Amino acid sequence: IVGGYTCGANTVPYQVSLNSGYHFCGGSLINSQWVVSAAHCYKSGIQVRLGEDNINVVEGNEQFISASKSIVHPSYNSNTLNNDIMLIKLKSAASLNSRVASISLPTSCASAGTQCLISGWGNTKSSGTSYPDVLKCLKAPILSDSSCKSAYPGQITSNMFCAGYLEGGKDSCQGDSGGPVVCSGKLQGIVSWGSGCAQKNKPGVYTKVCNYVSWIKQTIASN
Numbered sequence: 001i002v003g004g005y006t007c008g009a010n011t012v013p014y015q016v017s018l019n020s021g022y023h024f025c026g027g028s029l030i031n032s033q034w035v036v037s038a039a040h041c042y043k044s045g046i047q048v049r050l051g052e053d054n055i056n057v058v059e060g061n062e063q064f065i066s067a068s069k070s071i072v073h074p075s076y077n078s079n080t081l082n083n084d085i086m087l088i089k090l091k092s093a094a095s096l097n098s099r100v101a102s103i104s105l106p107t108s109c110a111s112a113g114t115q116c117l118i119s120g121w122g123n124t125k126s127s128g129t130s131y132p133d134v135l136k137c138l139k140a141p142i143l144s145d146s147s148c149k150s151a152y153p154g155q156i157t158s159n160m161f162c163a164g165y166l167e168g169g170k171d172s173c174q175g176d177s178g179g180p181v182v183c184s185g186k187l188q189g190i191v192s193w194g195s196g197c198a199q200k201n202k203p204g205v206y207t208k209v210c211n212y213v214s215w216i217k218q219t220i221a222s223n
Ligand SMILES: Cc1[nH]c2c(F)cc(Br)cc2c1CCN
Pocket: 171, 172, 173, 174, 175, 176, 177, 178, 191, 192, 193, 194, 195, 196, 197, 198, 203, 204, 205
């Protein structure tokens, strides 16, 4: 996250770190057994880390649970990033509490101008590279479809939205991938892609979660 703030320990209790020897992506806990992330975060050997603040220090509220199965969306295209969503099932159910909690799925899509909270352990620099230890947060509005398409001609599908600031300076970044965009208490987005981080006229692009709720629910129901 570039231009954000330190969230505070366990204040984003649905935020997960995906670890394969090291943090490589975020995700969102959606019930005791399932995490939502980005399809471009797929790899094998994933351990889900819940209750994290400093990802380099065991502080006492973590739960470390290996993935038993990952399911990349059937229509994910890795060239265009269309349908950039994945589900990860945990080998055992997480223990839910104030600091480890699921985030509700949307019942309808969100509107331009809605305020959202984006969070992650990604790069905090727009030029250069610095990776934080503690969770970072950014409040950012959803941008109009027309602004989003103007920023990225020919690249924005019906499964994507932009959020952030056209002036630059505040954005998600590398390593925030797969993490949450939460708006009015619902998981509306997944950190997906962009051109650089926090660059003028290049806001972040996010998977439009509301288009996937039927698939998420029926996947969970049979897996
Ligand atoms: C999700 C993602 N991953 C990135 C990456 F690996 C390198 C760079 Br430069 C940008 C990004 C973004 C977009 C952030 N709005």
